[PDB]
Design a protein around this ligand. Structure first.
Ligand SMILES: CC1(C)[C@H]2CC=C(C[N+](C)(C)Cc3ccc(-c4ccccc4I)cc3)[C@@H]1C2
Length: 279
């Protein structure tokens, strides 16, 4: 539990600072700056639920079904928001670094509020089912009490497939295309900043892959076990549960790392932070 709490403190501190710095600007904010601020807000909301998940996984849900509905809606909204914002940041980087000559602007701040509102609204509509269905069941298989759905198993499979194909696959493909072309362009440029650019892009892509792929791999394993492709047994189910726990831990680790890998490495944001601390 100590590592859980330590993860909590860093996550709150890191994202809170990023949101604080970006909200201390008296003028327009670049598109990527807006996306980063929204991502920081989403990640703060998402990490607010860490103690709940830890307690639930440790002993049992004891907060009732209403707190389930609220927390599940919170988590789904923030999760989808984080995924889609990480995809939108990469798309903005692509448009600004690959088509840079075709999108030149002589210092007007291109407003991007439309995409942010669309993302948030779509996330809310995606998370809708949590407000209605998520509750607390008394299982007979584990003799425990957790927060789960009450859909038909086919409905559970449909929801899992939707999660897989709208939270991992599409963002991942967008990121891959955008960042691969960014690398391709940067390796054919001339300057002393292309080096750190490629290194940071590669680090970001590797972090995303090796922090998200495990959980969705486990989700696909569960889908397969519910689709008849794999055989259900006590040992396999226990291993799936262990994988669930560890992969969720890794996901929270990524959520805590996000501020470092996206905000604190930029000279712009570091100058902003130092100026704000001076004030
Ligand atoms: C949170 C709750 C209290 C309510 C919502 C779902 C719960 C369980 N569940 C589904 C395990 C949370 C969950 C989901 C996804 C991730 C994750 C995966 C990859 C990358 C980043 C992340 I973040 C981590 C945890 C508990 C009931």
């Amino acid at each position: 539990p100590a590592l859980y709490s330590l993860l909590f403190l860093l996550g709150l501190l890191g994202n809170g600072a990023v949101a604080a710095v970006l909200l201390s600007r008296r003028t327009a904010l670049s598109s990527t700056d807006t996306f980063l601020l929204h991502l920081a807000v989403a990640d703060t909301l998402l990490v607010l639920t860490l103690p709940l998940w830890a307690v639930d996984a440790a002993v049992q849900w004891v907060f009732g079904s209403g707190l389930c509905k609220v927390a599940g809606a919170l988590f789904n909204i923030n999760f989808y928001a984080g995924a889609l914002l990480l995809a939108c940041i990469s798309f903005d980087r692509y448009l600004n670094i690959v088509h840079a000559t075709q999108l030149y602007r002589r210092g007007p701040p291109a407003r991007v509020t439309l995409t942010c509102l669309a993302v948030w609204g779509l996330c809310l509509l995606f998370a809708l089912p949590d407000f209605i269905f998520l509750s607390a069941h008394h299982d007979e298989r584990l003799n425990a009490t957790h927060c789960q759905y009450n859909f038909p198993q086919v409905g559970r499979t449909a929801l899992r497939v939707l999660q897989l194909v709208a939270g991992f696959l599409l963002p991942l493909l967008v990121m891959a295309y955008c960042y691969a072309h960014i690398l391709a362009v940067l390796l054919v440029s001339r300057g002393q900043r292309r080096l750190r650019a490629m290194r940071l892009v590669v680090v970001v892509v590797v972090a995303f892959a090796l922090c998200w792929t495990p959980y969705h791999l486990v989700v696909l394993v569960d889908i397969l076990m519910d689709l008849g492709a794999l055989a259900r047994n006590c040992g396999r189910e226990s291993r799936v549960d262990v994988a669930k726990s560890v992969t969720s831990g890794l996901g929270y680790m990524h959520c805590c790392l996000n501020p470092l890998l996206y905000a604190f490495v930029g000279v712009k944001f570091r100058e902003r932070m130092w100026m704000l601390l001076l004030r």
